[model samples]
Target chain A: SNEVLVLRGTLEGHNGWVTSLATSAGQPNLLLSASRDKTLISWKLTGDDQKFGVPVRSFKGHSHIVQDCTLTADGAYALSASWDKTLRLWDVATGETYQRFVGHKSDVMSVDIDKKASMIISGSRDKTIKVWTIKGQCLATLLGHNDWVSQVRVVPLNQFQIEADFIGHNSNINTLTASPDGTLIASAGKDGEIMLWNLAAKKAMYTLSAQDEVFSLAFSPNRYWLAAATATGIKVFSLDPQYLVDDLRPEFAGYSAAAEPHAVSLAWSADGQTLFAGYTDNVIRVWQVMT
Target chain B: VLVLRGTLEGHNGWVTSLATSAGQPNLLLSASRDKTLISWKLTGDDQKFGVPVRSFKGHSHIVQDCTLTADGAYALSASWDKTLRLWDVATGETYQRFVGHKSDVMSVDIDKKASMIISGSRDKTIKVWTIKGQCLATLLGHNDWVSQVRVVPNEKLNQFQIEADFIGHNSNINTLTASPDGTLIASAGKDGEIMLWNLAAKKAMYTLSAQDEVFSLAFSPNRYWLAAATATGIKVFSLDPQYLVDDLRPEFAGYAAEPHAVSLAWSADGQTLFAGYTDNVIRVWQVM
Candidate 1:
């Protein structure tokens, strides 16, 4: 099979470590990266050329290190979490802070937007998950985690109440993502284990060990595979039943060398043709699917 | 930038439909208001680029729509003559004629196995027929003209009924297409509005404004992209709900002086787009 990931190029701009990366299907060539430098840079992808290194706009508002960021479906706006215990929504075109959400008691670690664009979800070091509206109204606070909630994601389904608690991870959950069809959920973190959960069944379907901490997890738009950024490297799992036989083999693996810094975040393009991985070394690596 | 690759000129009247196959010759079929169908080879040198390889002539009125079998060996054309004709692509001969519609046939589509044909007509009915010229079902629901019909891919169920009524368009609906994975259905119309519906939920997911009358729509076979031929130009939109919520700008747009693109088709690889226009010509674009 020609399903191999080849490094296209490296995007170098951040002066500090890159924490998160975001891409929208509405704008495939546009990328947003949050860094420890307390800012987010919006970059235009110009193929494998020298001009690709330049930033379209750099947004600065958070007083502390930005932990995560995500773009609205239309790519017109961005919502980011910071160590300042706040989340700010920015106008992507003008690089202006449109609104700021203030409710978390501690550092905000992760942020996500719902499918309807009406609700925003954030996980924080205060051991809580908060849901807010686009207008900055705090809807409710979810309290269950005894430790810092590293990541959180909003399911694509209509109802949003706490349905069931998934108890399998041995350590803090670093990242979470749902399939495009909203049928399955994948969660992974410091436990070095990735768990696949069925929404309707309310149980774990499969558990795969990454052999290292998985910092981020993303489901391909095609829904056939899931990509994870681990301490060792990037691993792609085949969700199709035909390939998950006696021995579970990754569909593709890359960047596991000892010299390379660990990838902290992962994002896939709309067509699932490209993957953007942010490393702790302050670099963004572009990987294209060969076939 | 979307660059114009080439243009094929042969139809004497408005080119109404376009279809493509991944077979050896990479065949392209075009139907026109001139009451005939033309097949062209998409490969080889530029010397034979605009030349028609075969001409299928049998319909007595305007040929409104056409579709090719997966292997490119056969074709089915819907005509205003109140009938649909199945043609042998190699010999350009009509092997079977399906006649049942009370009015003009406007659109036609064949199942993957080429065993069944679905047609929409001006009589406001959708009909299902077999390759043996047998009428299986006559669906009566639309209050106006039934301009488009598409069989859901990979579906083998025998039950036929209206699933959902997506009411948002201000004008007549012109085209309808299902996503490659068959999770959603997109419909566009003369009002320049495109409504995406969830097939499973039977509800409208989103509505996008095209800003111009949309004549045709096609979903990329391997990507999360939807392309529409509008009166002003060709507009491509991302089907991702995240992007579809409020983004009015299309991911890509192509313009031509002639302006009226009636139909469209994508190459098997989804890299090239072929558009049929009222200029009596087919224009090809490299979707980069």
Candidate 2:
């Protein structure tokens, strides 16, 4: 029996495109979403209470549209990047800003955290990434991208400092993701290419041509699939064993495109059972990965 | 300075725990919050640090911890679903499902001789299970969550008596680790406390407050240091009483600014240390 991804649920709330999503630790049913609506909403999706996405708390403070958001590994706090060129760290319990940092020259496009390193890196339209301390100090500036750093993912290469950057995208980087085991970092560019970097070696082992400009990218939690989103739909590639070992090839696996697949962001459920795609219409189409 | 080794990809969620067989150099086992125990082949070099050969799935919820048998034949897993499952690494089958914990099963360890499975649970209890699938004994002492438990090295596999000594620092026991030869069993808890137990004699060897509350722990193969994970860093301490260990009290090996360190493991030769984070990234540090 072949496993296929199917539509499971639609998480609806944001008036604008959902730009970011983060799942809580231990609790599989809780998720946090940041949107262009300028709000960070905590959602609860557990045992039939709502049966769908239920907003538990809405963190409202950003003066401009929120671009991206992430939660700490322990689900203790949340960090959100905004077009206002600021990053706000919020305590999830009280929905209050724990710390705030302003450094970027333009809209903050993406944000990621390395909980072990206690470092938060945010990419901006200013063509740079700023590294910050969990306590709100600007630790360092990661510079390389000529265009706006559309996405930034901190490779857990070393403690306190990042080992290397997966540089070399000619155009705006659309999104960035790391393999679950932290071995590989995949950067999808608006140029229609995805670079797979081997964190240990600090180089792009291979680049895959997704046949369209990548609007979003996500590596499945199990490391089995790497999904790249396009204006049309999302393409899934098999990072299967052989593709990972000797051949090291990214094989095309599957594709899912809704009637209007203007996908803006993507996330995998903690269990790897489902894939949630946030389209520009602010409707989240949940796809089940039949394994 | 710690050199970053390559990352190992596979688990869908937090790599709650990792274990390697004593004599089986290639066999590295990792359990995940994804509810699967993956049997991986490790080559150490960048060629491929970890390759998932088989994935054992059956646990209904997050797999909190796991350990391999001394010979690397089987894996024991503690899960949030309140069960311990024994897995056949070679066959990828559920050999047995250990059911008894009233709440989440937090941690699991195998004996030095591979005769018994030692487990700690959120239920605040420690239990010993025979490899033959029998609940040998259930011990209780901690007032809060029993985060970790391990059998001190019992070479004389027949004698199963364990003396329980209750101590202070009564918060959640976040982790339990054992030396390769099983002489020392270390327990770390939420209160930044660590206990090195002389398992062979059923006694606490050293009790000290760690740099922070511990989330995970690992012992070096050379019996030199114990590595512990805290909120945002990894701390290494000398297990060797003599300064024969050149790398005692290494500087704080930092993690990502936001994700907490969840699990820790060591290379067979003690040349490398790996920490798994809540962000699902596993970072490797080469011991210099």
| Candidate 2 docking classification | incorrect
Best by lDDT: 1
- In Å, residue B283's CA in model 2 sits off its true spot by 50
Candidate 1 C-alpha lDDT tens digits along B94-161: 99999988889988887676767878786556676778886654544323222223333333222221
Ten consecutive residues with minimal summed lDDT in candidate 2 chain B? B242-251
All candidates: DockQ: 0.01, 0.01
Give a tens-digit lDDT track for model 2, residues B1-288: 456666677888988887867678777788888889888877767836777799888998999988887788888888999899888889999887788778899877666667777777775667777777666555454253222234444332223323333333344354566677767767775567887766566456766566566888788887568877877477777765722232222233555246666788886778777777776656667765
Task: Name every residue pair that clashes in candidate 1.
Answer: A73-B242, A73-B243
Expressed as tens digits, the lDDT of each residue in A58-158 for candidate 1 is 99989999999999998999999999999999999999998999988889988888778887988787556777778896645544323222223333422
For model 2, the stretches where C-alpha displacement exceeds 4 angstroms are A47-51, A145-160, A171-174, A241-261, B1-288
For all predictions in the order shown, the interface RMSD in Å is: 19.3, 24.6
